[PDB]
Swiss-Prot record, chain A:
Residues of the full protein shown: 604 to 654 of 1407
Phylogenetic classification of the source organism: Bacteria, Pseudomonadati, Pseudomonadota, Gammaproteobacteria, Enterobacterales
Signal sequence coordinates: none
Family: Belongs to the RNA polymerase beta' chain family.
Designated name of the protein: DNA-directed RNA polymerase subunit beta'
Subunit organization: The RNAP catalytic core consists of 2 alpha, 1 beta, 1 beta' and 1 omega subunit. When a sigma factor is associated with the core the holoenzyme is formed, which can initiate transcription. The rRNA transcription and antitermination complex (rrnTAC) consists of RNAP, NusA, NusB, NusE (rpsJ), NusG, SubB, ribosomal protein S4, DNA and precursor rRNA; S4 is more flexible than other subunits.
Applied relevance: Co-administration of salinamide and rifampicin or salinamide and myxopyronin suppresses the emergence of resistance to both antibiotics.
Superkingdom of the source species: Bacteria
Curated annotation (Swiss-Prot), chain D:
Lineage, broadest ranks: Bacteria, Pseudomonadati, Pseudomonadota, Gammaproteobacteria, Enterobacterales
Shown chain mapped onto the complete sequence: 504 to 553 of 1407
Transmembrane segments: none
Biotechnology note: Co-administration of salinamide and rifampicin or salinamide and myxopyronin suppresses the emergence of resistance to both antibiotics.
Protein name: DNA-directed RNA polymerase subunit beta'
Subunit field text: The RNAP catalytic core consists of 2 alpha, 1 beta, 1 beta' and 1 omega subunit. When a sigma factor is associated with the core the holoenzyme is formed, which can initiate transcription. The rRNA transcription and antitermination complex (rrnTAC) consists of RNAP, NusA, NusB, NusE (rpsJ), NusG, SubB, ribosomal protein S4, DNA and precursor rRNA; S4 is more flexible than other subunits.
Post-translational modification note: Acetylated on several lysine residues in the presence of glucose.
UniProtKB/Swiss-Prot annotation, chain E:
Family: Belongs to the RNA polymerase beta chain family.
Organism: Escherichia coli O157:H7
Role this protein plays: DNA-dependent RNA polymerase catalyzes the transcription of DNA into RNA using the four ribonucleoside triphosphates as substrates.
Complex formation: The RNAP catalytic core consists of 2 alpha, 1 beta, 1 beta' and 1 omega subunit. When a sigma factor is associated with the core the holoenzyme is formed, which can initiate transcription.
Domain of life: Bacteria
Protein name in UniProt: DNA-directed RNA polymerase subunit beta
Shown segment, full-protein numbering: 697 to 945 of 1342
UniProtKB/Swiss-Prot annotation, chain F:
Keywords per UniProt: DNA-directed RNA polymerase, Nucleotidyltransferase, Transcription, Transferase
Transmembrane segments: none
Species, as recorded: Escherichia coli (strain K12)
Role noted for this protein: Promotes RNA polymerase (RNAP) assembly. Latches the N- and C-terminal regions of the beta' subunit thereby facilitating its interaction with the beta and alpha subunits. Part of the processive rRNA transcription and antitermination complex (rrnTAC). The complex forms an RNA-chaperone ring around the RNA exit tunnel of RNAP. It supports rapid transcription and antitermination of rRNA operons, cotranscriptional rRNA folding, and annealing of distal rRNA regions to allow correct ribosome biogenesis.
Reaction(s) this enzyme catalyzes, per UniProt: RNA(n) + a ribonucleoside 5'-triphosphate = RNA(n+1) + diphosphate
Complex and partners: The RNAP catalytic core consists of 2 alpha, 1 beta, 1 beta' and 1 omega subunit. When a sigma factor is associated with the core the holoenzyme is formed, which can initiate transcription. The rRNA transcription and antitermination complex (rrnTAC) consists of RNAP, NusA, NusB, NusE (rpsJ), NusG, SubB, ribosomal protein S4, DNA and precursor rRNA; S4 is more flexible than other subunits.
Organism placement in taxonomy: Bacteria, Pseudomonadati, Pseudomonadota, Gammaproteobacteria, Enterobacterales
Protein name from the UniProt record: DNA-directed RNA polymerase subunit omega
């Protein structure tokens, strides 16, 4: 997106676009409440079969 | 108690519809407290008028097709959602829209009521392609506050909902978008102060500043229960 | 064994709880892993490093 | 890191969700339904964009 | 203590030597911040002596990394104690178990990029509890040497000094125990002999303008390192056999 | 000019000859005390020089014109 | 304008520390609006009294050891930070503590002032081991708001600097934990309209009803800027 924007618009637009992407990216990452539990590490039921 | 109140510094009015506001210096932690509490009332609780029901002739439902007309009936309803209307006296007005021949049907083609002001008369509502074709509809505007969709109205009201009446999502609160940001207030000794910066997005019926003033009033009216 | 112990304290199997943003008050979109991790203050302190 | 995960979570869609197949005036009415609490960021919707 | 241990915590804390442990079990006769005296049971107690063990606990003392070492009594006044139990806890130990840090409520979720690359977001409440607050005992020495020109003095009488510096010093020129000090403040007033140095004419004018002309003895006082600051907990004085002693000494 | 010096580079060309012109004009306002063409707007002599290049007021050739004007005017008071 | 204001219904005081406050009826959306905006003022902005200065006799600094006492002086200061005190009249009161003989020195051993109420008298401060041992100290309680550390306070004032005065981190804000809920109201036929349960978990001093009154006051005084000044 920033490579496209750099070649179409210029330097100024990209610098502001890159920032706004950073701002919204952090903020909506925070909203999401994405996490890491032990159940999030799904194992296939057929592992002991394959081995 | 070292009560430090901010005061309204500068109101950068970029347009009558979009205007920015800087506030300083606010006491630390009240940066986001008022910013959000206000944003919430301004999104959902603000009063204004909006298209609720429409009834076009030659139309049994919103999915059907009218010959000689560019937009599907859904896309016409979408244009009426975004039709700015201010009813001065009454809480409910049903406006009539009849028009024919080749032209983009604008908001000025609606018959204006003695106490009804259509805020953007050049607002497109439908496009007539054929000269032979003509469109007729009855647009009901009601007043409320905040945002009441067709889905959250069919859930609440299971009263009269007859076939052919097209429901349209109401945008009563004149506020289209609203955003508050906070960075950092530097004073003499305090440096952990914050300065609230909200950018409210209105339609034109209500002024940015006015809307904010009303939202603070509704909040203070809730504080009447808690004495001081 | 851990999940079994979680049920003894009337806490979820998941070890993920619904948290709410302190600023806003509204909920985060999904359950978030929360619990007690024993952390340690290392000797690399910034008053010395600056 | 967080930034990619955030735009990823935003853009990606999900089955129905809150308020599927609705019709919005613009990008600002989409922010209105999300912050108003009537649509998921993952709802398939028709929106007018210029 | 750690809530999620392995069990080795107690083996480590005890074998480390930093915890004061019961040489013989019995009843604690006397408990105190400074020391613990335990009377021993007859069966283990030796028949010759009284059979009362003394443990004078090593108190807020410096480490090699300038960190803190304190032994607190972890048994109460007149408590029955078994042999090989921990009578007093070390700096990083709690009821005998090893306690290197603190356990706390942690949530795994991003937050406005304040936990960007393993960057950490901590509540004011942890800082308010002063629980991750650390003690740093710090050792600074003041040496009176012998230059060609003469021996160095340690007196409160120092050329070129405001009353702000000499305020926390005593008659001998040593800071009081307990006095809070910050970078610039003099801890020990040392003054050194200097030859009668060639004053530049501009300096000679300026010294003649105020009148206060530099003495033969210059200055080299031990003063708090730049930016660092704490409370004086102790002062120790080593005088050579035959040199004149301070009244503080 | 404030963050972005791309507009000033597009006006001269070379990133290096830009720094050389901007510094020359910065040094005039720093010592000589020349008056700025763009409103000051409370910025450092460096940014004033960049603003003036961005707008196309200061240039390698323009600076030589204006140096020859001040120089040769004093040479004419002599001769 | 259908302006529908809530009123204070019931304050379920389970304890003097923990108390529920129910609020109805709230129009849709105002439940979470006041809920959080109040929670924030109730955490941070609430005024309360806290031990600021202590001065123990036979003590030159907080790191030293006093004979006949199980606790090091730091651990005593820690106990005084969490000493529940209510000053009624003045903003600053200096209380005296003298006590001797074998026993846990409780908060009740402090000499109560005409207009000073010690909220938990059984609160532990120090443990006397020896009968011969006696402790003497002067505990200064001042009133403030939020949390004022001893490190923030040892770098501002410092006009008089008396050696033997131990400064203590002030835990002024009385609210420890607070969490608002939203529940059905079952009023007239409103259905939509519900209530707002604010569960407050404070020290002794500040009274639940009193505190919510003060917090609503602080919010309305900050709103003067958005109502009056446009």
């Amino acid at each position: 997106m920033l490579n496209t924007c750099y070649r179409i618009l210029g330097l100024k637009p990209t610098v502001i676009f890159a920032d706004q992407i950073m701002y919204t990216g952090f903020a909506y990452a925070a909203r999401s409440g994405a996490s890491v539990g032990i159940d999030d590490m799904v194992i296939p039921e057929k592992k002991h079969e394959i081995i | 108690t070292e009560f430090l109140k901010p005061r309204l510094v500068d109101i950068e009015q970029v347009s009558s519809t979009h205007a920015k506001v800087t506030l300083e210096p606010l006491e630390r932690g009240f940066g986001h407290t008022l910013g959000n509490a206000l944003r919430r009332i301004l999104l959902s609780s603000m009063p204004g008028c909006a298209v609720t029901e429409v009834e076009i002739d030659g139309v049994l439902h919103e999915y059907s097709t009218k010959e000689g007309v560019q937009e599907d009936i859904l896309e016409i309803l979408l244009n009426l959602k975004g039709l700015a209307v201010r009813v001065q006296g009454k809480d409910e007005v049903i406006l009539t829209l009849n028009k024919s021949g080749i032209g983009p049907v604008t908001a000025a083609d609606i018959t204006h009521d003695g106490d009804v002001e259509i805020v953007k008369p050049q607002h497109v509502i439908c496009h007539l392609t054929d000269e032979n074709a003509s469109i007729s509809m009855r647009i009901k505007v009601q007043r409320g506050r905040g945002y009441v969709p067709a889905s959250t109205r069919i859930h609440s009201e299971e009263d009269e909902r007859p076939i052919g009446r097209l429901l349209v999502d109401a945008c009563y609160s004149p506020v289209e978008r609203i955003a508050y940001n906070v960075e950092a207030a530097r004073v003499e000794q305090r440096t952990d102060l914050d300065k609230l910066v909200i950018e409210m997005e209105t339609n034109g019926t209500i002024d940015p500043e006015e809307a904010i003033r009303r939202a603070a009033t509704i909040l203070a009216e809730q504080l009447e229960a808690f004495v001081d | 064994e851990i999940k079994e112990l979680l049920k003894l304290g009337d806490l979820p199997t998941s070890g993920q709880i619904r948290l709410y943003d302190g600023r806003t008050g509204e909920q985060f979109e999904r359950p978030v892993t929360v619990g007690y991790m024993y952390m340690l203050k290392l000797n690399h302190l910034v008053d010395d490093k600056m | 890191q967080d930034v990619v995960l955030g735009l990823y979570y935003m853009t990606r869609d999900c089955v129905n969700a809150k308020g599927e197949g609705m019709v919005l005036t613009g990008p600002k009415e989409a922010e209105r339904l999300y912050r108003s609490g009537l649509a998921s960021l993952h709802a398939r919707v028709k929106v007018r964009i210029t | 203590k750690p809530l999620v241990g392995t069990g080795m915590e107690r083996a480590v804390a005890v074998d480390s030597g930093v915890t004061a442990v019961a040489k013989r079990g019995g009843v604690v006769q006397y408990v105190d911040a400074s020391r613990i005296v335990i009377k021993v049971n007859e069966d283990e107690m030796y028949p010759g002596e009284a059979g009362i063990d003394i443990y004078n606990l090593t108190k807020y003392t410096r480490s090699n990394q300038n960190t803190c070492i304190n032994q607190m009594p972890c048994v109460s006044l007149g408590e029955p104690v078994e042999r090989g139990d921990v009578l007093a806890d070390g700096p990083s130990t709690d009821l005998g178990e090893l306690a290197l840090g603190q356990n706390m409520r942690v949530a795994f979720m991003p937050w406005n990029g304040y936990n960007f690359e393993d960057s950490i977001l901590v509540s004011e409440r942890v800082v308010q509890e002063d629980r991750f607050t650390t003690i740093h005992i710090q050792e600074l020495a003041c040496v009176s040497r012998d230059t060609k020109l003469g021996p160095e003095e340690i007196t409160a009488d120092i050329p070129n000094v405001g009353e702000a510096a000499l305020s926390k010093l005593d008659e001998s020129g040593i800071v009081y125990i307990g006095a809070e000090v910050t970078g610039g403040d003099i801890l020990v007033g040392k003054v050194t002999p200097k030859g009668e140095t060639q004053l530049t004419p501009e300096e000679k004018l300026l010294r003649a303008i105020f009148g206060e002309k530099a003495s033969d003895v210059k200055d080299s006082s031990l003063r708090v390192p730049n930016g660092v600051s704490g409370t004086v907990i102790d002062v120790q004085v080593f005088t050579r056999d035959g040199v004149e002693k301070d009244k503080r000494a | 000019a404030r963050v972005t010096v791309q507009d000033a580079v597009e006006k001269i060309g070379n990133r290096f000859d830009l720094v050389l012109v901007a510094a020359r004009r910065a040094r005039q306002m720093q010592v000589g005390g020349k008056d700025p063409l763009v409103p000051e707007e409370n910025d450092k002599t460096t940014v004033i020089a960049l603003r003036e290049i961005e707008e196309g007021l200061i240039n390698n050739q323009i600076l030589d014109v204006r140096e020859r004007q001040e120089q040769q005017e004093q040479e004419a008071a002599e001769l």
